[PDB]
Each structure stands twice: as structure tokens, then as C-alpha cells.
Design a binder for this molecule. Structure first.
Ligand code: MG
Ligand code: MG
Ligand code: ZN
Length: 600
DNA sequence: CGGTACCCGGGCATA
DNA sequence: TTGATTCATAACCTATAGATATGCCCGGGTACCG
RNA sequence: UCCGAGCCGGUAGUCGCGCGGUUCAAUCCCUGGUGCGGGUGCUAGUACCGGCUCCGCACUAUCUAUAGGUUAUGAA
């Protein structure tokens, strides 16, 4: 449920023109960012130093104690046995790490809220990493050990001999996940590679469940897998394969948004005593520093401000909190045909790397939202160029290029990395302290919002005030094919949902191999013509590319006697849009998806 | 000079 | 869908988790008394 | 290491066509849009009325930190 929402507005328009409050909040957020960064680094340092014997169990108390020790040192006096024990255990190396990195103790006062937020965020990052990239990383390690790439490149494809190996590995996956109990003969029959992989997997001491797979165990108790993940990272480093970040480190020196609440407000911004704060209403207390009459603070869908924002000094995130807060396959068009039937107009979109949205309707009014247009309107390319120019002028790129890997588990290498970072820490901090980096983020947000609004307005003008959007199911989410730029595929669903425009998915399978004029796939031609590579550096290198967005039909019926080409040329995006139109018409007419596009 | 008791602000804990 | 190994700093995207307030005490100062 | 969109043709619903011609749109500064009125500012010939610009009435628009893949750059 949408219990929370945010209206991101500018810093100038969010707060009243009082320099004292602005300076106080800027200083506070800077201090909290420094504390979070150094706390993540100290946690990594402690884990690597104590890894000589065993991996310590990391809990909320551990990170909280690390943060408190960094801020105050031994002056922190926890009143609970667990926190006291954590402080006693973690104290010895905190000062050593601070001296190594020259970390001067800030001894910030009234850090309760900020330390709690940072500890919660760090534990969240740990849990998210463990959940997301444990199973995936383990399977990646298994495949790397099996050398699946080598077998694929060397062994014949689509053959029973290698289908046998594929089935063998698929069945062994269940044994690795403990879903299927292996027999003694099954274990004996394992080849040396399979036996070694099974033994190494068991060395991680992975948890187990009686009636559920390993993924269910990860979902239920993800935190228990942290030692296994660390050992897997160590194995990755030992074997020489590319390393991965097991412990999340907040290495970015750019100013980061810091939560600011009413307590922080009256402790640092207003600097009034807790006694006086309780005597004033929250809205009245906030009006002294924020213009609540501003549009950004208006209530939407029953949600109110309730005094909670995160600011980075340039853009202010104003969060609207619903009164009911916690107090601290169905999207496909096949299942949404009635909505399309009652829609005033139906528009089908075929996502692509370049043509992010290629739109068409029954009336034939074509519309597209290309990647180049998005780059121009958002300004990502211009901002990247300016950032590169600034880095070259300041020489920051040279400094950063020599920073060792943060993902290494080696203690001495990590110490050298920390020393290198400290060598030019001041220069990079000063460079990234420039307002452009935050102002760049704020301007990127504004440009993206304006581009989305313009896209919606153009679509409404072309197709009408009310219309329904049908989009292909293809989505390069998470993964991204190498040598290809990132593209927005799944965010358009959210964008259309925000603008109260229906967004229904559709299967793109074999939607670029059918000619609409004859509804046949035999005569469709692909990659028939060659031309120099469109990418300038490849073109200079002399490479040649095959056209993918151009398709033609060899069917004589589609041709005309006067033509000399011998084929009816087509646009890949246009073909996909026409095929989607035909599929949607068939579905709405009740005939279902055409048999030509149907799967095997 | 020496000792007792109350209030305020902040530190620390927990839902 | 569309192109043909290791590291760091940005970005784009995608996914995950979290998105504040009240109470106890303690010690340091002050008022009061002997 | 580069790139806006629309229209007219070579095209016949064709190409990262570094194919030709033509129209307006953005490069700084800016949270965005939607319906109402006013104030008068600019846009058109005598209330006809569309458009751009501000004012304020109310409906709507979730961000943050981290990891992964990729891109740009700097190193290998
Ligand atoms: Mg598609
Ligand atoms: Mg396509
Ligand atoms: Zn055909």
C-alpha cells in the first residue's frame, strides 16, 4: 500500500530565507554522511581483522556500537548487557582504524536519531545484498567452476550428448540446494569436478529447511547467510575470478541525503530545549523553518507532512505520511481485455534499446520516444560531459583510477587502499563539495519530470485525453547485455500508473518475424544488408555491422511488378507495432492471439 | 566549612 | 533484444528495506539547612 | 564516443540512410501537470476567444542508502 509519498522540491523553496537554519542543517547532514561512511569502513575493517579466526556475527547492536565508538570513543556508556559487550569487543580496533585513516572523533551531540537511522540503513544494505546476490553468486561460482562457457564454446551445441550434461547439472542443482536427497551411489558416481563442487558448497555451512528449498530459507532467514557469503567472496578472490562486494561500503564522497525529523530539527536547527519543543505544536514548530503553505507541502490522497524530510543541501525530499502509518501475470493485456474494450483509444508500444517507446494506434497516428530524445531532454549526456571535464580539470580521475579494489578480503591490501584514499582524501572531498554534483542531481530530476510530462501531453494530444497503453513484456531489468547501453523498460509502467494511464503488458515473442500484409513468417528477411558500424570508434576501426531494424518480405503478393528491390521493406519497430495491433484486435474480437505468433 | 534535597538538560534505551 | 580479463570514480536501470517518538536516570548546579 | 522531434520524397507503412528539403524545440535558470476564476501583460479583425505570461482556489505526481549488470572516463 502507498502509506508514504514524497514531493521533491528545491532547497530554496522548501525552507524560509534563514541562513542560520540552512547552515545548521547543512553541517548536520555533512557530519552524518561522514559518520555513516566511516562507520561502514570501520565495520569492514573490524570484519577483516577478526576474519583471522572466525567471522563475527553482525547485528544491529554491532553497527550501533561501531558508530557510537567512532563518534564518542570510550565515552559511550551503554546501559544494556548486549550493547556493553559489543562496545567492549569492538573498542580495541576503532582507535587503530581512526589513526590509520586519521579520523578525528567528531563527538557529535544528540546523535540518537541519526545513529539509529544509519544503523538501520546499514543493516538493510547487508540484508538486501545477502538476499539478492547469494543464490545468484553461488550459481555463478558453480558455473565458473564447471566452465560452462568453455564447454559451450568447445562442445557441440543442441546435441543429446551435451543435453545429457545439461540435465546432469540441472539435477545436481537440486542436490546443491538440498531439495533432493542424494543417494550413496549418486554421491559415489559424481565426477571429481562435481564432487569437489559439492564439497566446497557444503563448506559454507548453508542452512537447511525440512519442507522448503534453499531459496525459501534465504527469504525466511537471510541474515544467517552472511558468513557463507563472506566465505564465498574469499573463495572468489582465491580462485582469481572477478571479485564481488560482499560488505556494502558507503564510499561515495558526494553529499548524501540525511533524514531530518522534528527531534533533529529542534536539537540542531532550532537549537531549542526539549522542554520548549513539547509546548509547541508540530506544525507551528515546523512553520518557523519551513513554508508549509508551499505547494510541495500540500496534502495528497489524505497524506500530510508530519515533519519528515531528507535533504542533501540542494534538493529537499518532503515526505507525506499517512495517518495509518506503522508508527516506526495480472498486468498482461490478456487478463485486462475489458479495460481495453471500454478505452477511448488503444495505443501499443514496442520497447527497444534505441526506440524506448515506439507507439501506434488503430488510426495509424505513429508516435515514438527515442533514447536520443530522452538523453537530450533529461540532459544526462551533457551532465556526463561536464562532469568529465571537471574531473579532467581537477585531475580527480587520475587520483581515483589508482584506488585499489574495495571488494578485496585481504587485510594488507585493504590497509593500502585506505592509505591511498587518505593520501588525496582532502582533494576529492573539496572537488565533490562543489554544488554542481547535488545541483546536477536536482536538475536531472527536474528534467526527467519535464520529459515525462511532455511525453504524456504529446501522447494525449496525438491519441486523445483518455487512452490505454499496451506495452511489450520485454524488459532488460537488472541484467544488461554487454556492449549495450542501459535503457528504461520497467519504469514506464510506474510512469503511466502515476499519470492515471493504463499500462498493460504483452508478449513480444516472435513479433518481429511476421509481415502484417500477409501474416507469414517464411518470407521475412533479417540482416540482409551490411553497412559500416554506426558507432564512430568501430567505424574508424573498420568494423561492419548488419542492420537489425530493417526487415523485408519476399512474398510475391506483397511486392509489385514495378519494384526492382524484390522485397517489401519494413521497419522493425513498425512491424512490431503492427503485429501488436493485430494481436490486440484479435484478443478484443475474442479470437485470441494469432496462431502465427504462438509459441511452440 | 560541610551535608541534603530538588530541577534541568542531556544521554541512553525501546516500541 | 543486438550486438561480438582485472580495478576506481560518476551516470542509468532494477530491486530491497526503510522511511520517529517517549520515557528513565544521572549528574551537575543551585537552594536550603546545620 | 557521436548523436532533438515532426512533415514532404528516393519508398510502396524501410533501415543509428555520416540520403535530400522543410517547420519549431531544448542547451543556462528551473519540483511537474490538470480544472476554475482575475489582471490585465503580450498576441486578431470588429462581446465574438483561441494561444502565450503571472496571481490563487483544489486534484494529483515517493524518495533515500546500498548491491548487481551496463555505459562514460581514468588506469591496466
Ligand atoms: Mg519489442
Ligand atoms: Mg524492435
Ligand atoms: Zn508480406
Amino acid at each position: 500500500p502507498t502509506l508514504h509519498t514524497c514531493n521533491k522540491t528545491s532547497f530554496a523553496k522548501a525552507f524560509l530565507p534563514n541562513e542560520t537554519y540552512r547552515q545548521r542543517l547543512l553541517d548536520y547532514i555533512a557530519i552524518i554522511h561522514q559518520l555513516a561512511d566511516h562507520a561502514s569502513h570501520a565495520l569492514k575493517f573490524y570484519i577483516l581483522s577478526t576474519s583471522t579466526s572466525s567471522f563475527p556475527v553482525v547485528h544491529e547492536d554491532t553497527i550501533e556500537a561501531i558508530l557510537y565508538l567512532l563518534n564518542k570513543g570510550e565515552a559511550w556508556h551503554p546501559r544494556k548487557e548486549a550493547k556493553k559487550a559489543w562496545r567492549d569487543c569492538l573498542l580495541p580496533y576503532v582507535q587503530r582504524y581512526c589513526q590509520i585513516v586519521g579520523f578525528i572523533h567528531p563527538n557529535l551531540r544528540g546523535e540518537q536519531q541519526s545513529i539509529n537511522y544509519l544503523t538501520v540503513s546499514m543493516m538493510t544494505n547487508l540484508k538486501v545484498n545477502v538476499q539478492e546476490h547469494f543464490m545468484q553468486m553461488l550459481l555463478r561460482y558453480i558455473n565458473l567452476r564447471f566452465d560452462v562457457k568453455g564447454q559451450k564454446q568447445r562442445l557441440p551445441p543442441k546435441s543429446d550428448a551435451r543435453k545429457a550434461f545439461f540435465t546432469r547439472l540441472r539435477y545436481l542443482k537440486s542436490v546443491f540446494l538440498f531439495d533432493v536427497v542424494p543417494e550413496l551411489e549418486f554421491l559415489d558416481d559424481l565426477t571429481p569436478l562435481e564432487s569437489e563442487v559439492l564439497e566446497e558448497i557444503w563448506s559454507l555451512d548453508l542452512p537447511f529447511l525440512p519442507n522448503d528449498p534453499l531459496a525459501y530459507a534465504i527469504v525466511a532467514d537471510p541474515m544467517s547467510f552472511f558468513p557463507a557469503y563472506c566465505k564465498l567472496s574469499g573463495l572468489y578472490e582465491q580462485y582469481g575470478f572477478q571479485r564481488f562486494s560482499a560488505i556494502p561500503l558507503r564510499r561515495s564522497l558526494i553529499q548524501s541525503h540525511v533524514r531530518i525529523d522534528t527531534i533533529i530539527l529542534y536539537q540542531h536547527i532550532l537549537c531549542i530545549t526539549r522542554r520548549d519543543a513539547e509546548t509547541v505544536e508540530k506544525d507551528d514548530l515546523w512553520m518557523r523553518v519551513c513554508n508549509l503553505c508551499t505547494k510541495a507541502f500540500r496534502s495528497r490522497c489524505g497524506m500530510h507532512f508530519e515533519g519528515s524530510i531528507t535533504t542533501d543541501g540542494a534538493s529537499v525530499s518532503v515526505y507525506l505520511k499517512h495517518p495509518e502509518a506503522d508508527k516506526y501475470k495480472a498486468l498482461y493485456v490478456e487478463n485486462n481485455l475489458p479495460a481495453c474494450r471500454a478505452a477511448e483509444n488503444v495505443v501499443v508500444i514496442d520497447p527497444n534499446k534505441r526506440d524506448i517507446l515506439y507507439c501506434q494506434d488503430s488510426n495509424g497516428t505513429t508516435f515514438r520516444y527515442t533514447a536520443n530524445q530522452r538523453a537530450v531532454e533529461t540532459g544526462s549526456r551533457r551532465f556526463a560531459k561536464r562532469r568529465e571535464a571537471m574531473k579532467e580539470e581537477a585531475g580527480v580521475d587520475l587520483i581515483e583510477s589508482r584506488i585499489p579494489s574495495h571488494k578485496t578480503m585481504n587485510l594488507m591490501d585493504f590497509t593500502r587502499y585506505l592509505l591511498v584514499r587518505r593520501a588525496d582524501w582532502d582533494r576529492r572531498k573539496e572537488f565533490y563539495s562543489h554544488p554542481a554534483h547535488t545541483r546536477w542531481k536536482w536538475h536531472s530530476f527536474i528534467n526527467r519530470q519535464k520529459s515525462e510530462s511532455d511525453l504524456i501531453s504529446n501522447m494525449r494530444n496525438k491519441y486523445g485525453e483518455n487512452f490505454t497503453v499496451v506495452m511489450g513484456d520485454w524488459s532488460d531489468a537488472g541484467r544488461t547485455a554487454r556492449f549495450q547501453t542501459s535503457s528504461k523498460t520497467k519504469g514506464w509502467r510506474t510512469l503511466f500508473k502515476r499519470n492515471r494511464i493504463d499500462c498493460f503488458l504483452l508478449d513480444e515473442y516472435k513479433t518481429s518475424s511476421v509481415c502484417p500484409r500477409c501474416s507469414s513468417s517464411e518470407f521475412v528477411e533479417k540482416k540482409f544488408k551490411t553497412r559500416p558500424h554506426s558507432r564512430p570508434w568501430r567505424r574508424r576501426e573498420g568494423k561492419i555491422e548488419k542492420v537489425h531494424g530493417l526487415l523485408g518480405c519476399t512474398n510475391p503478393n506483397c511486392l509489385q511488378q514495378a519494384w526492382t528491390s524484390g522485397m517489401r521493406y519494413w521497419n522493425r519497430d513498425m512491424l512490431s507495432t503492427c503485429n501488436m495491433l493485430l494481436i490486440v484486435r484479435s484478443m478484443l474480437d475474442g479470437h485470441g492471439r494469432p496462431e502465427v505468433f504462438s509459441r511452440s
